[PDB]
Design an enzyme around this catalytic site. Sequence first.
Site, short mmCIF file in Angstrom:
data_model
loop_
_atom_site.label_atom_id
_atom_site.label_comp_id
_atom_site.label_asym_id
_atom_site.label_seq_id
_atom_site.Cartn_x
_atom_site.Cartn_y
_atom_site.Cartn_z
N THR A 22 0.92 -1.02 -0.13
CA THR A 22 0.15 0.01 -0.08
C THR A 22 0.53 1.38 -0.09
O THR A 22 1.70 1.57 0.39
CB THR A 22 -0.93 -0.32 1.45
OG1 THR A 22 -1.92 -0.99 1.14
CG2 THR A 22 -2.19 0.95 0.96
N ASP A 128 3.79 -7.37 -14.03
CA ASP A 128 2.83 -6.48 -14.25
C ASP A 128 3.06 -4.90 -15.56
O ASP A 128 2.65 -4.01 -14.35
CB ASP A 128 1.66 -6.53 -13.15
CG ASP A 128 0.92 -5.50 -13.05
OD1 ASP A 128 0.05 -6.16 -14.27
OD2 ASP A 128 0.66 -4.52 -12.55
#
Length: 254
Positions: A22, A128
């Site tokens: 995060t 990714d």
Amino acid sequence: DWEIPDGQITVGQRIGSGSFGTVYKGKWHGDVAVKMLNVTAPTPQQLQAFKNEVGVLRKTRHVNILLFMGYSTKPQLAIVTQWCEGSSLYHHLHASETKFEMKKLIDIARQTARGMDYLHAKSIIHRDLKSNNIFLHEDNTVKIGDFGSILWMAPEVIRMQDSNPYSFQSDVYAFGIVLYELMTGQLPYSNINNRDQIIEMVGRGSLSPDLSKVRSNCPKRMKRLMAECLKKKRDERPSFPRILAEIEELAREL
Ligand SMILES: CC(C)(C)c1nc(-c2cccc(NS(=O)(=O)c3c(F)cccc3F)c2F)c(-c2ccnc(N)n2)s1
């Protein structure tokens, strides 16, 4: 050693979250991003696994790769990087709709190729890559980072029948879609209306981006390059050294 002693990093405001962690805006000798991990009381197996990641990020020093700066173990496990001022390429193309000319499009493409070439030369696979993770710092310098996004997935990764589906080649396919976006201004599969159909057809080998949709002033070298990166058979895609060199020749002709 890059361990940042306790009490030095000030943590500000929550930006969001990606593949892992995060992310927060912070402060340490100026601005930094702070990626929290949320591990509380790390076991030796989580601690060494943390240092394995740190040890892969530490292996990168390049202007087109997000800059690894440090890490904390107390009070949380956390990673400190350079703070990118501005916003992402995804944002610039399908949110702002920023009117870049072709000079700038190919420049962005070139800087991303440089970063991926670097990543691959150091044996690191992104896994990714997508326009969302190509940050345009100061609206000028690409920063690649961030090591619900099936549009950038190669066929062999959507299948997942292979033992090692992620590779340089799947990194290269993903770059091909970043090129589709750059040159069409559009996400691929504009008119297919359900992600399960897009998954299926890409995986079974019967659906790749329609390149007739590229903008008029798109170069012919770039048409060819996209076509070659987006190939279905893994082994028939170019490596980054050649991708870089074709775009560096392209940049000059322009
Ligand atoms: C929205 C989303 C995708 C959640 C973001 N993640 C990061 C972010 C923040 C910190 C690290 C990494 N990338 S990482 O964790 O993969 C990484 C390192 F931790 C170290 C070196 C390279 C690297 F890619 C990030 F993608 C963002 C980020 C990074 C730098 N500046 C700004 N403004 N945002 S935005």
